[PDB]
Amino acid sequence: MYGDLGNKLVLEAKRTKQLYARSNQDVNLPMYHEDIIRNILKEVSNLRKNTEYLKEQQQLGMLDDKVAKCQYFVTLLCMERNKRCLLAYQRLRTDILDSMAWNNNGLDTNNLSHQEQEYLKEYCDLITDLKSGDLVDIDLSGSLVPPSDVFIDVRVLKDAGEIQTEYGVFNLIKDSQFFVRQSDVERLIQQGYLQKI
Amino acid sequence: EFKDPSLSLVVPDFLCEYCFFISDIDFCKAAPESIFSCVRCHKAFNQVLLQEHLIQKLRSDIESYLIQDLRCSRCHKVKRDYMSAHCPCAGAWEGTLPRESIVQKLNVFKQVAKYYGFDILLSCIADLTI
Amino acid sequence: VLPVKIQPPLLRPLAYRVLSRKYGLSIKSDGLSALAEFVGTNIGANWRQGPATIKFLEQFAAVWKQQERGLFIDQSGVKEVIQEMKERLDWRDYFKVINASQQQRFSYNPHKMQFIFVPNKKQNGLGGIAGFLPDIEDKVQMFLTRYYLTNDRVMRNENFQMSITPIKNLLGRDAQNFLLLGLLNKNFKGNWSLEDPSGSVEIDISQTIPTQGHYYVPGCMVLVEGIYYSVGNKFHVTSMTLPPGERREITLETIGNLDLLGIHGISNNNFIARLDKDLKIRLHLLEKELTDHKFVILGANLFLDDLKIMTALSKILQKLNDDPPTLLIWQGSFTSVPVFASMSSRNISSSTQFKNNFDALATLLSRFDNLTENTTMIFIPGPNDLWGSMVSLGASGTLPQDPIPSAFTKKINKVCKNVVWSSNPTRIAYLSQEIVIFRDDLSGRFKRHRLEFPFPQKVQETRKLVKTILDQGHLSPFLDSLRPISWDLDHTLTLCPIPSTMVLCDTTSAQFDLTYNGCKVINPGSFIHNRRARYMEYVPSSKKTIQEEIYI
Amino acid sequence: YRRLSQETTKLKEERGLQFLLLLQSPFITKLLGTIRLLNQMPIVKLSTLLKKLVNHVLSSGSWISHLIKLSQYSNIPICNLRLDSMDYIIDVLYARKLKKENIVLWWNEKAPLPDHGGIQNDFDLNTSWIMNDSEFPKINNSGVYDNVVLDVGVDNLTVNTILTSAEFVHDAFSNDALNVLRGMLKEWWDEALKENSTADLLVNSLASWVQNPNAKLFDGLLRYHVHNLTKKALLQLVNEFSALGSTIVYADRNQILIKTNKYSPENCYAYSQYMMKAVRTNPMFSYLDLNIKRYWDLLIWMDKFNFSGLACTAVSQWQLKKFLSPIYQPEFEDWMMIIL
Ligand SMILES: [Zn+2]
Ligand SMILES: [Zn+2]
């Protein structure tokens, strides 16, 4: 029946939402199901051809006020259902992409559809526009854990040599440990070079 | 353990026209005088002719690799069809001329070409890769 | 510009406050030395002199985002920013010849119904020798890939979405109608047969009605309707047809609009290059703008070792030097005999004679200045050219054939400004037109091998030729036992996004310039035929095809 | 180069006819020569170091004698045949006999391949195997041999097998054409026994023609049919020698080394000639040039590039030696002499 592929697609949606929700990290989302989506879009085209065929044969008009009305209603509702299933899948994966944009890129690519790849590019461009115009005094993409401490100890987890900061340097020697202002190192904790807190 | 230090590179049925002598000559195991000249009479062989025969052998082996039959790796039946992924006895298909042997043949060809200064054969070997 | 008064310990706060505080880019010290001298050589005075500091740092960060070279600034990245700033249409930038060995390989995945890039391991360095050799795995996947591309194309055709059943579904479903898609085998037992990725079945053609606009040969992908019979395990063919071709644009958009040539940019294993629609439109407008350009194609079997050929050719070139082509395709068997290992040393040896012919040809080209410095020479080998001839003895052999060896090009290469010795199935990528060129004498092979069903001539046979090739989607429909293919390079013989034009040079059929599914297919035929020298002037900016001749 | 046309025209004015022109020698420029030369002559085509030139000049009369002998034998005109390729004479003569025995002739002018019609243009797996394959299954029984060993040279194996030779089989050469080649070779052989020097030169050159792709009647199936018959006969020759109680150290298409079951050459100079005669008196090997080329008293053998022995006087050759470093190559030879 015309709705079954929609159920299979949104079961895929439910499983990938759980795959994202259960883990503490941002898990890189799974492959875009082009095959099931092609099957559903083909089903939509079948339903469109059915409506065209019926609306042509309404000029012959077989009990049309009830029978053709009912046939048209059912084949229209099948298309509404399949639109809902497709949009549910795409809106979920869109939400995950937006979450990933804020969590990383505002500071696995094969799995996206090419529309989703260019969508993500545009949404990252939008985020970087927000933290560039007005309100730029706040890095709007920064952390949402409240600042617990102004100075922290941080252990260098990967080597990165001598780099500057606003009035000094760090030499990121492997398994050296700093005691430093948190606001000067947060970028490197997010990039995974520094360990603690 | 003793393994023979010489890899044979034989050109079969080479002809000395000056005495109609049909010799297989081995560019690695033969002494250089027996390569560049006959061994019944002792007239010298033309260098470009000799390089041509080595190129004919080289291309013969590249073709013989590409046209080979595949064989089943455990029951040794020949692959009789065009689109099976494995033999019906569960075994994977393998070449009857495994790729390693052909790399070895090309290696002796590059050695022979470098040593005897065979410019044309060396250009052929170079044009395979590049 | 004022003398430089900017240094890293002074620029440090502002470099951080832009790159790090805004964009997360990390100020590595050597990279900051390079950045500070670049900034200082542009600004001159001290960093405190107004917005010029943050303006330039914003420009640096933007260009860094264009090049994307990493999370830390470094001097090579600074030089990359400089290069992008220096670059802040010419048809040479887009026209290019693409050999078989140079063409980006894409495997086709049927489960995901899409192409995937495969790197050429000639790059691998360990392949400095035997880097070209195919693996055994390339052989077992060869015919599977042809089937999957064909089956995929069939499914996109409106007539099917009754539909195909794979051959292995037949077994045990007695006396029932089925539609098959199959590789046309002849079994080891001798009976005609179809094969599928799932299996094969023997066929009876004794009652069949083939569709008439096609040749049918062994190894061809053929649609077959019929009734399966378990009693002899035969399939009784009602009717047969080649799978319908698919127009270029229809193919390109549905495969995802890939750049399978690098006409817009090179692909990588992490990044499939995309055929940008805007640039495609700009290039097509330019392609329509260049009224003057002209591709000239000489006929096949241009034997340089016949004086009559050289005499005729000197007349043709003496016209072309008045008004040079954009491009000049030479092609096909540049020696009368195939050149193979000479049996005896008394005569000048066969390889030597092959070199002397290109000495003579280079001597001809020396007389023609306008031609040699404005055309692009393209040479396309045939059955009599050199390392192919060594082992085939002039028969048609291993098909994605090598360019003629550089030991014999040398004098040509010194006189001609531009030359490309290219594989026999070479490709031109023009502004938007992909153009295949191929030199094979297919027509003889088809008629010599076509299936003989029980139960004007020139136009009919040439329509049968091109319709076979383009519906079949692939330049060599024959089994490898009838035409061996280098297994790695079979992807170059496939045509799946059908080319915009095809120079399908065939020595054994009339000259023609048909159009089919928007593909314009031209055969210039034999160079010297019926006391006339013959050549063909393809006009890319209008797709006309003015044939030309000289009496001799 | 205008002098060449001037000289040839002056020759034509001194002799419009009644003179014959001898063209060229192996540093050929033949086609360009025909461009400078007036093409209308009747021409015998031919393919401080001036001694070479004078020797050719004074060779001319013997060349004309040899060419007249070739023409009078072969029934071919003087200008058309080439001294440079006996294969072409063999081609025209074989073609004559084939058509006289009513075989459709596979002569090819344009390409090496046998003209079977259009089908020779196509690749074929049998054809490619036929063309690619040549190697003898050469025997090499390594060891020490305190027996005397006979170094039997061989020749005429091709000729002997063509003579002693004798669809369901699809890469065998046509049996009719093979019968014509056999009978014609018997004809040539008989005329060589009667010392037609041209016939002997022909029979000696047959081994080229069955392999030369430039032969007008070249056929891959013919080359292969001859080759694998040669293989089979070499194995039968080994079978005969072993059937006479001897044992084979080595064998290939040009040579056989045989363990005798005897201990001293001075005892065996009679027995060896008995053995060789006993082979050649078998009809299968009637025409072989069996030749006892060396007598070995003691032989150390691993391959024909790595052996040593005493001959009837000590010889040593080792490709093994060549791979030792230089300080040890003299050492190896010294210890080889000590071991011998
Ligand atoms: Zn010799
Ligand atoms: Zn098996």
CSV table of N, CA and C and ligand atoms in Angstrom, one decimal, chain B residues 71-78 86-93, ligand 2:
chain,number,residue,atom,x,y,z
B,71,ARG,N,40.8,-18.9,-12.9
B,71,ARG,CA,40.6,-20.2,-12.3
B,71,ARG,C,40.1,-20.1,-10.9
B,72,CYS,N,39.3,-21.1,-10.5
B,72,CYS,CA,38.8,-21.1,-9.1
B,72,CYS,C,40.0,-21.5,-8.2
B,73,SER,N,40.1,-20.8,-7.1
B,73,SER,CA,41.2,-20.9,-6.2
B,73,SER,C,41.3,-22.1,-5.4
B,74,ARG,N,40.2,-22.9,-5.3
B,74,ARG,CA,40.2,-24.2,-4.5
B,74,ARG,C,39.9,-25.4,-5.3
B,75,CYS,N,38.9,-25.4,-6.2
B,75,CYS,CA,38.6,-26.6,-7.1
B,75,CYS,C,39.3,-26.5,-8.4
B,76,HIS,N,40.0,-25.4,-8.8
B,76,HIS,CA,40.8,-25.2,-10.0
B,76,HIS,C,40.0,-25.3,-11.3
B,77,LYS,N,38.7,-25.2,-11.2
B,77,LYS,CA,37.9,-25.1,-12.5
B,77,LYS,C,38.2,-23.8,-13.2
B,78,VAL,N,38.0,-23.8,-14.5
B,78,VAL,CA,38.1,-22.5,-15.2
B,78,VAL,C,36.8,-21.8,-15.1
B,86,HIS,N,32.0,-15.4,-7.8
B,86,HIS,CA,32.8,-16.4,-7.3
B,86,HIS,C,32.4,-17.8,-7.9
B,87,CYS,N,33.2,-18.8,-7.7
B,87,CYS,CA,32.9,-20.1,-8.3
B,87,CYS,C,31.7,-20.7,-7.5
B,88,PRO,N,30.9,-21.6,-8.1
B,88,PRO,CA,29.8,-22.3,-7.4
B,88,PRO,C,30.3,-23.2,-6.3
B,89,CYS,N,31.6,-23.5,-6.2
B,89,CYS,CA,32.1,-24.3,-5.0
B,89,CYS,C,32.6,-23.3,-3.9
B,90,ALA,N,32.1,-22.1,-3.8
B,90,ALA,CA,32.4,-21.1,-2.8
B,90,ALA,C,33.7,-20.4,-3.0
B,91,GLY,N,34.6,-20.9,-3.8
B,91,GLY,CA,36.0,-20.3,-3.9
B,91,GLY,C,36.0,-19.1,-4.8
B,92,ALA,N,36.9,-18.2,-4.4
B,92,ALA,CA,37.1,-17.0,-5.2
B,92,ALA,C,37.9,-17.3,-6.4
B,93,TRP,N,37.7,-16.4,-7.4
B,93,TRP,CA,38.4,-16.5,-8.7
B,93,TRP,C,39.8,-15.9,-8.5
E,2,ZN,ZN,35.5,-23.6,-7.7
